[PDB]
C-alpha cells in the first residue's frame, strides 16, 4: 500500500 | 529472508504536450505488483502481480485516490521546483520519489526510506531517523522548510513504520510461494577464442530470483575485478534475472580461472570452471 493521503492537504514540494 | 517494499513515483513535465505525467509503480523486492499511470486512457491502479489481485475494490479505490491526488500535487511540485531553480517554462523536468520499508529476516522494520530527486539529482531525503531531512541545495531547503512547517516527516514516519510494514508483511504472506522463494541461478561457463593466444570465458547465471547476485572470476584464486566484464543484471521477463561475467584469458590458462557465484537460492556458493 502506498503512503496514504494525510488528513489535511497533501503537502507539495 | 529480508524483504522490502518500494514505491517509485515519476512525475514528468512536458510543456506544450499537456500536464505532467505521473506514474507510480510498487514493488516487493524485485517483483512489481502495482502500477498507476495518469496517461492511461482511464487512470486507475492496476495489479501487476497475481497475489495482489485478491485485494478487494476498496483497496484499488484507495490506491487510485492516493495516486490521483498525488498526480495533481506533483504538478504543483513541478511548478514549484521550476521556480525554485529559476527555470524557464520551456523545459521538461522530472521529480522522482522512491520510498518504502525494509524488513529483516524476522519481519521487523530495519529502516525506512523516502528519497526524492529532481532531474535525476538528489533533491531531498528523509533521514534514517524518519524525523529530519537532508536537502541537497537551497532549492530543496525551501521544500524542507515547507515540509517542516507541515509536519510532513511525521506523516512519512507513521506510514513507514506502520502501514508500510503491515502491508509488506501481508503481501509477503499472500505471495509467499514466489516472494519468499529464492530461485537459484542456473549456471554454465562458455569459451570463445578471440585470437590464437586468448579466449573469452563467460560465466552465466540464468533464471534466478531475486536479482541480487554475485558473479566473479578469479585467476589462481585472486579476484579479477578490473579484468572482468560484468553486465548489468537484467530481467528475463518471467520474474527471473540473468547476468554474466566474462574474462579474456591466455590460451592454455583456462583452468586457472574460476567463476564464483553467490545467490540466496543456492544451497551453497558455486565454483565453476570451463568444462571443455
Amino acid at each position: 500500500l502506498p503512503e496514504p493521503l494525510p488528513q489535511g492537504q497533501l503537502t507539495a514540494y | 529472508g529480508s524483504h522490502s517494499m518500494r514505491y517509485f513515483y515519476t512525475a514528468m513535465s512536458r510543456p506544450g504536450r499537456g500536464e505532467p505525467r505521473f506514474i507510480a509503480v510498487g514493488y516487493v523486492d524485485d517483483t512489481q505488483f502495482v502500477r498507476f499511470d495518469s496517461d492511461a486512457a482511464s487512470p486507475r491502479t492496476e495489479p501487476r502481480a497475481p497475489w495482489i489481485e485478491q485485494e478487494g475494490p476498496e483497496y484499488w479505490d484507495r490506491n487510485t485516490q492516493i495516486f490521483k491526488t498525488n498526480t495533481q500535487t506533483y504538478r504543483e511540485s513541478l511548478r514549484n521546483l521550476r521556480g525554485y531553480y529559476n527555470q524557464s517554462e520551456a523545459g521538461s523536468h522530472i521529480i522522482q520519489r522512491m520510498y518504502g520499508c525494509d524488513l529483516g529476516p524476522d519481519g521487523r522494520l530495519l529502516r525506512g526510506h523516502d528519497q526524492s530527486a529532481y532531474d535525476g539529482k538528489d533533491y531531498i531525503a528523509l533521514n534514517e531517523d524518519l524525523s529530519s531531512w537532508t536537502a541537497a541545495d537551497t532549492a530543496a531547503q525551501i521544500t524542507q522548510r515547507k515540509w517542516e512547517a507541515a509536519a510532513v516527516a511525521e506523516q512519512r514516519r507513521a506510514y513507514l513504520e506502520g502501514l508500510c510494514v503491515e502491508w509488506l508483511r501481508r503481501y509477503l504472506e499472500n505471495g509467499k510461494e514466489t516472494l519468499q522463494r529464492a530461485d537459484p541461478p542456473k549456471t554454465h561457463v562458455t569459451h570463445h577464442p578471440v585470437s590464437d593466444h586468448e579466449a573469452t570465458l563467460r560465466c552465466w547465471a540464468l533464471g534466478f530470483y531475486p536479482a541480487e547476485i554475485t558473479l566473479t572470476w578469479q585467476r589462481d584464486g585472486e579476484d579479477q575485478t578490473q579484468d572482468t566484464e560484468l553486465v548489468e543484471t537484467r530481467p528475463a521477463g518471467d520474474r527471473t534475472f540473468q547476468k554474466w561475467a566474462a574474462v579474456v584469458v591466455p590460451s592454455g590458462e583456462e583452468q586457472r580461472y574460476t567463476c564464483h557465484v553467490q545467490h540466496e537460492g543456492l544451497p551453497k556458493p558455486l565454483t565453476l570452471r570451463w568444462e571443455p
Binding site: - | 517509485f8 515519476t10 514528468m12 506514474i23 509503480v25 514493488y27 512489481q32 502500477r35 499511470d37 501487476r48 521538461s92 522530472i94 522522482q96 522512491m98 530527486a117 532531474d119 535525476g120 539529482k121 538528489d122 562458455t190 570463445h192 563467460r202 540464468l206 553486465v231 548489468e232 537484467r234 530481467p235 528475463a236 521477463g237 518471467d238 540473468q242 554474466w244
Partner: protein, 99 residues
C-alpha cells in the same frame, strides 16, 4: 544532467532455433525517461512489442524492458534500436545469443 541508456538484447530462455522464445531489449541507466525502443527483425520494426512499466534504480536512472515473442533461426537477425535525447542517432544493438 543527462544519462545515456545502457542496452542489452537477449532472450528470455536459452536460444534454440525453431523454438519460440522472447526477445528482450533492456534499456537502463538513462535519464530523462523519454526513450524510443524498437525491436528489429532483419532490420524491420517488429510491431506491437510490449514493455515494462517505467521504474528506476537507486541512482534515479530509469529502466525499461521491451519484449516480444520470437522464434530464433540461424539466418534471422534480431536487434534493438534505441533513441534517447542523449543519442545523436538511434543506437542499434544486435542480438547475439552468446551475450
Amino acid at each position: 544532467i543527462q544519462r545515456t541508456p545502457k542496452i542489452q538484447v537477449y532472450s528470455r530462455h536459452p536460444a534454440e532455433n525453431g523454438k519460440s522464445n522472447f526477445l528482450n531489449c533492456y534499456v537502463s541507466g538513462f535519464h530523462p525517461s523519454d526513450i524510443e525502443v524498437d525491436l528489429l527483425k532483419n532490420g524491420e520494426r517488429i510491431e506491437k512489442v510490449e514493455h515494462s512499466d517505467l521504474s528506476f534504480s537507486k541512482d534515479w536512472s530509469f529502466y525499461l524492458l521491451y519484449y516480444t515473442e520470437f522464434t530464433p533461426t540461424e539466418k534471422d537477425e534480431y536487434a534493438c534500436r534505441v533513441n534517447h535525447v542523449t543519442l545523436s542517432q538511434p543506437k542499434i544493438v544486435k542480438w547475439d545469443r552468446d551475450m
